[PDB]
Symmetry: C3
Subunit: 332 residues, 3 copies
């Protein structure tokens, strides 16, 4: 037996009315495929003579090891997109523009404009607050070696006439000078001062000074000759005073030097010395002493003499002449 089977093309079977007997094989001549009867279904309704079920395969691939789009996308959604996030490099670029508390160099203007909780009082207030209690360096060090400039090293301004605090307050304890101003020897000379003060306030002294020295002056002024030439400074003075009218004023009645003792002093009110030797002085009662010959271009009013070294008055001279003129009138 060489066995052959009912056979025709798939599509021919597809519209055949032939019922294969149970187990009877039929062959699709154009596919090579066989199908077996069940005794009732038409060919197109039989299944193939062998399994077509994925689970029955061998050498399956590892499907359960493969990543699902859903599961992958859930995991991606937890990850940060490149575009919503700075790189380390861009991060560093940004931070390098910010000032470290450890310190740094400002190349632009640092403004303060406090919103003000209270900005406190004492040594815990201030927009800028510097405590050097544990350290040996300076607080605010401002300098310039520039040739010229348009603004000062430091400037303090108050704008409103009611302003009821100071521009600068110095509260000092220590063993050297609270405030020290050194204007040192010019090469190119200025016509100006170490400290210059002007006040247009008529109800207050331009400068007020109180001290309580045991053996010194409240203000001590020393003039030093700028030259080795004995008389170069002949127009100089330790203290110079001028008394002027207002521009377009009619004049002035201001005094030059006014000295008082409100509690009363027993010291000399004015004491003038040269080489530490008294030369002139006004005692606490207003009597003066002068060491040398003196001149008045005018008269001197004074009391009649009682001691030999007293200046005589015209009254005293005249009376002594008149006395002698009488007495001598012994011509009866």
């Amino acid at each position: 037996l060489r066995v052959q089977f009912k056979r025709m093309k798939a599509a021919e079977w597809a519209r055949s009315d032939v019922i294969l007997l149970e187990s009877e094989i039929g062959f699709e001549t154009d596919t090579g495929f066989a199908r077996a009867g069940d005794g009732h279904n038409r060919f197109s309704d039989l299944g193939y003579i062998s399994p077509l079920d994925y689970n029955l395969l061998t050498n399956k691939p590892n499907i359960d090891g493969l990543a699902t789009k859903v599961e992958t996308a859930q995991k991606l959604q937890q990850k940060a997109d490149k575009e919503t996030v700075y790189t380390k490099a861009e991060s560093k670029q940004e931070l390098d523009k910010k000032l470290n508390l450890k310190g740094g160099v400002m190349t632009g203007q640092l403004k303060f404009k406090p919103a003000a909780t209270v900005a406190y009082s004492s040594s815990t207030g201030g927009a800028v607050n510097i405590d050097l209690s544990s350290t040996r360096g300076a607080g605010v060090v401002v300098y310039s070696d520039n040739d010229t400039s348009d603004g000062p090293l430091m400037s303090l301004r108050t704008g409103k006439e009611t302003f009821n605090q100071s521009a600068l307050f110095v509260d000092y304890k220590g063993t050297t000078n609270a405030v020290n101003i050194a204007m040192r020897q010019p090469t190119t000379p200025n016509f100006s001062s170490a400290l210059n003060i002007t006040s247009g306030n008529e109800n207050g002294s331009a400068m007020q000074l109180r001290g309580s020295e045991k053996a010194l002056g409240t203000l001590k002024i020393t003039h030093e000759n700028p030259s080795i030439g004995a008389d170069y400074d002949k127009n100089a003075a330790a203290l110079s005073i001028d008394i002027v009218k207002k521009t377009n004023g009619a004049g002035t009645a201001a005094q030059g030097i006014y000295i008082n003792s409100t509690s009363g002093t027993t010291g000399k009110l004015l004491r003038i010395r040269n080489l530490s030797d008294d030369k002139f002085y006004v005692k606490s009662d207003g009597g003066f002493y002068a060491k040398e010959t003196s001149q008045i271009d005018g008269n001197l009013k004074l009391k009649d003499p009682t001691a030999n070294d007293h200046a005589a008055t015209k009254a005293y001279v005249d009376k002594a002449i008149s006395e002698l003129k009488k007495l001598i009138l012994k011509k009866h």
Copy 2:
């Protein structure tokens, strides 16, 4: 021939003892599947009449193109999670709170509390160090246009009596005033000064001033009449001095003005002028000059006259009278 095959249900075959001959076909009536004998194995041990090997399929899907869970997870592990990382927006929000070195506006208090490497010495020390050597602007500009306040523009305090530096040190070179204080004309008047200084230190002058002017005063004071009225300022003075006891003190012996020359000067020690015309003066030897009639409510002790314009003493008058009284006693 319509050929039919040994046939029964899968599960019936499954416990049949029938051995299909080599190549003899048997049919599972409930699956449609055939199996062929090998001449020894029971049906359930034969394989199907056609391949069930994944590798022999056609139209395979691209399995090797698919991503494995393992490989995907390795790649995810290199990616940054959203939660461990700032967005650009959150990054910007944070940096916008930090101060640019280029500059910015502080709305709160900037404290310094240096840890101190040394904090240096000279023009490279300081918690705040400002070098204006290459620029034309001001260093520290502090101002207020507020009506009133609880603190000063600038405050300098030292707490310990040993403190051996200054609160403020000014070392100036230039062509204008090192330090300039302008208190300009009040609308609402203060009873205070441009500069006010108090010292309770008995071993040091409250203020010390040294200058070396060729032709000026070390201190120059000018009083200007605040009014056009010639005599409005009649109680004013360029210099006013008071000398007081301590509260509950017994008094004082302090002098008003003390002038000395420790090296000896040939200048006038006190020179008083009006309209640049000498009116009174004390020469370097203590002789004085007064331009006009003067008064002493008391006597004057002085030496016997030798020139015609010298004040006569009571001794000199008395001796001349006594001489004339003798001589005239020519009555034998």
Copy 3:
């Protein structure tokens, strides 16, 4: 019929020249597989008797639900790598080192070195610019409670002799003192001052002061006895002046006190009081008054008396004697 088929091993078929008739089955004895003739192809060129097409399987797995390496990698490429990006923690660590505009504490040196757009002029210039116009706290608060130190609280230096701005400029409006210096009572005494000024400039006053008080001194100085002991301060003075030569100088001609009125004043040029009672004074014309007995160790040159209380001259005495001597020569 038990039907058996042409059969041999796969590899034997593989080189058989046998042509199966159309539909005639042949069996691979070592695989169990059948193939059916087409009437022309050799065995190795027939296909299996049943389908081997993936698309015809049942129980396919969801291949289209699986993620492709390509698609996964495209999605990964949008995600940021861990290594190119700061964590929140590292971000915070970096920002915590930067200064908040809200405020903070510097532990190191804040230098300024302005690049300078113009650094402006007035109350909008400055490397540090503090506006307290809306607030009640201090501007710059510098203090130290340290025992000793190597630098001052504040330092202002200018290096070039042309420098044409001030170190410190105070422009004040208000109702208290523009600048106030308090050196308060020492426990450990300093031999120094609240304010100390030195100038080596020979073309300018060390200090210049101008005021326009109605009824006060431009400078007011008060010395207060530091002790309750009436005469403890007997060597003290409100104002002390010294006049010295240059080191290795030949001497000096500088004056002590120089008083002038450039516009002419009607006030007393020098007025000395004790307990508010005039004791000595120099009037605007140079006439003086002294309240008590006075002494000159020398002569006094003055004009001939005209009133009874005028000091007599030697000329006047001599002429009156000579007159009486003549007249009395009535002895013919």
